[PDB]
Amino acid sequence: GHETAAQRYSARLLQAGYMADYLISGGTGYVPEDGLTAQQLFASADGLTYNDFLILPGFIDFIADEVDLTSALTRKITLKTPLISSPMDTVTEADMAIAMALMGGIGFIHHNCTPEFQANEVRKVKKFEQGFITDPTLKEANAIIARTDLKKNRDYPLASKDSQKQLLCGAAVGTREDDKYRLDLLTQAGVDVIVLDSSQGNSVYQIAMVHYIKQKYPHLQVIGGNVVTAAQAKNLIDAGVDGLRVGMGCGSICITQEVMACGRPQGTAVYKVAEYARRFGVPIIADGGIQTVGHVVKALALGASTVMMGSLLAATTEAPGEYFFSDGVRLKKYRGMGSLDAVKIAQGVSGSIQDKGSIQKFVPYLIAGIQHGCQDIGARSLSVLRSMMYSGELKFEKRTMSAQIEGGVHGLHSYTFLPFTK
C-alpha cells in the first residue's frame, strides 16, 4: 500500500538526527487540511473539464527520472508508458503503431480502409521487430535470428513487446455484421487487442459484438466503445470487456455536442467512469481533449490508466498522408472519423495541424513532462498517484476564469515558447 506524505517526511527526518507523538496518532501525522478531494471536487455537479481545476503540490523525496509510468491497458496488457495513438485515418497506420510501441505505448490501427488493408497494416507492425523469425532458448541470439533486432532491443528500452518479442498492435472494428470478417483477418494477422469504436458504446449492437468476440476468440482483449456515465460502463463490464474508452463530444475535431445534445465534460466523465470501473478491476482510456502534458497528468490523476491522443499526434512524421504548406506554414490534414470527408450528418470537422517532427523526439518530451508533474505532486509512480487520489491524500483546487487567465501568460508585449531543448 502507498505511503502518505507525513510518513515519508518522518522517515526522512529519521534517517538523520533532526514516545507520545507515535502513541497519540499512531503514525498518521498532523498535516493541515487544504483543498478538496476528488470526491468533494465532483460533488458540486458542475461540469468540469481539465482546465477547470488544479492539483495541489505535495512532498518531494525523489527525483523525476525515477517516476514509474507502468500502466494497465486492459485486465491483462501492461504498457511502460500511458500513451495510446487514436484509431483515426489521419493518425494511426503501421508507422505510427510501430513508433508508439517502440516508445513503450501502443497504437490502434484505424478501420476506415478495407479488411485486407487493415490486416496488412497490423502484420507490418507484428513483423517489424522479431525474436525467432519463424516465417522468413531465444537467449541464443547474442527459424532465423538477426542482430538488427538486438539493435532495436538496445535502442528502445521501453518497447511494448509480446511473449514472442514482437511489438504490440491494436486494431479497430465496428459493430456491423461484416466486422466479423475483419476480426477473422485481424486475429490471423496477430492483433493483440481490439477497440469497438462506437461514439456511444452502450448499445445492443456493441453488447452482441462483445459476447461474440469473447466466445470465438477467448484469449483476445476487447476495449469497450465510448462511454461517459457509470450506467453505460455497467452494461459493457457485464458483457465482459477488458477495458473502456471514455469521452463523448470532447476531442478537438468533434461537433457531436452541438449536433446531438449528448456528451459530457471530459474531467467529470473520466473521474465517474474510472471510479465505477475500478470496482471490477477494469482500466480506463481517457480519449480526446488532450492539448498539453498538464491535461495528461490531470486525466491520469482523475483515475485514467492510459491516455489516448488524436490531435497531439497528428502532423508528426509517422502520421498518415503528406505535408502541404498552403498557409505559409508546414501543415498535415487531421479529419475526424465522422466528418463527411472521412441523409448522413457530420459528427466531426475536417481540418489541418502544424508539423511536430517525429514521435521519437516528441514522446520522450511527454514522458519527461508526466514525470515532472508526478514529482511536484510527490507521486513516485502513476499507481501511487491514483492511490493518493482515491485515499483523499491528493488535494484539488477549482479555478475561476480569472484564475485560468492567471495560469497562462499575462501582460508581456510578446513571448516565445520553446517546450523542450533536446
Ligand X SMILES: O=c1[nH]cnc2c1ncn2[C@@H]1O[C@H](COP(=O)(O)O)[C@@H](O)[C@H]1O
Ligand Y SMILES: NC(=O)c1ccc[n+]([C@@H]2O[C@H](COP(=O)([O-])OP(=O)(O)OC[C@H]3O[C@@H](n4cnc5c(N)ncnc54)[C@H](O)[C@@H]3O)[C@@H](O)[C@H]2O)c1
315 and 256 in contact (C-beta within 8 Å)?
Answer: no
Of 98-157, which residues contact a second copy (CB under 8 A)? none
Q: How far is the CB of 168 from ligand GTP (least distance, A)?
A: 11
Q: CB nearest ligand X: which residue?
A: 348
| 157 interface partner picked from ligand GTP, ligand X, a second copy, none, CB below 5 to 8 A per type | ligand GTP
Residue 189 as a binder of ligand Y (CB under 6 A): the answer is no
Of 156-215, which residues contact ligand GTP (CB under 6 A)? 156-159, 161, 165
296 and 370 in contact (C-beta within 8 Å)?
Answer: yes
What sign results for the dihedral spanned by CA atoms 296, 302, 307, 310? negative
Q: Looking at 199, 245, 246, 313, which residue binds a second copy (CB under 8 A)?
A: 199
C-alpha cell at 146: 538477426
374 and 333 in contact (C-beta within 8 Å)?
Answer: no
Q: How far is the CB of 164 from a second copy (least distance, A)?
A: 21
Residue 309 as a binder of ligand X (CB under 6 A): the answer is yes
What residues contact 225, with CB distance under 8 A and at least 6 apart? 175, 195, 196, 197, 198, 199, 200, 201, 206, 236, 245
C-alpha cell at 325: 504548406
Q: How far is the CB of 341 from ligand Y (least distance, A)?
A: 12
Q: What per-residue string of b and e applies to 398-413 under the rule 16 or more CB within 10 Å gives b?
A: eeeeeeeeeeeeeeee
Residue 216 as a binder of a second copy (CB under 8 A): the answer is no
Active site residue 113: no
Interface characters, 254-283, with ligand GTP (x: CB under 6 A): ------------------------------
3-state DSSP assignment of residue 376: helix
Residue 145 as a binder of ligand GTP (CB under 6 A): the answer is yes
| 197 interface partner picked from ligand Y, ligand X, a second copy, none, CB below 5 to 8 A per type | ligand Y
Interface characters, 278-317, with ligand Y (x: CB under 6 A): ----------------------------------------
DSSP H or E segment with residue 406: helix 401-407
Residue 151 buriedness (CB in 10 A; 0-12 / 13-18 / 19+): exposed
Q: Looking at 213, 299, 337, 367, which residue binds ligand Y (CB under 6 A)?
A: 337
3-state DSSP assignment of residue 120: helix
∠ CA 106-110-112 to the nearest 5 degrees? 175
Closest to ligand Y by CB, 92 vs 130, is: 92
Of 331-390, which residues contact ligand X (CB under 6 A)? 336-339, 347-348
Closest to ligand X by CB, 74 vs 347, is: 347
Closest C-alpha among 407, 395, 398, 419 to residue 49: 398
Of 257-296, which residues contact ligand X (CB under 6 A)? 287-290
Query: Which among 169, 250, 254, 374 is annotated as catalytic?
Result: 254
C-alpha cell at 36: 478538496
Residue 2 as a binder of a second copy (CB under 8 A): the answer is yes
Q: Among all residues, which ones are annotated catalytic?
A: 254
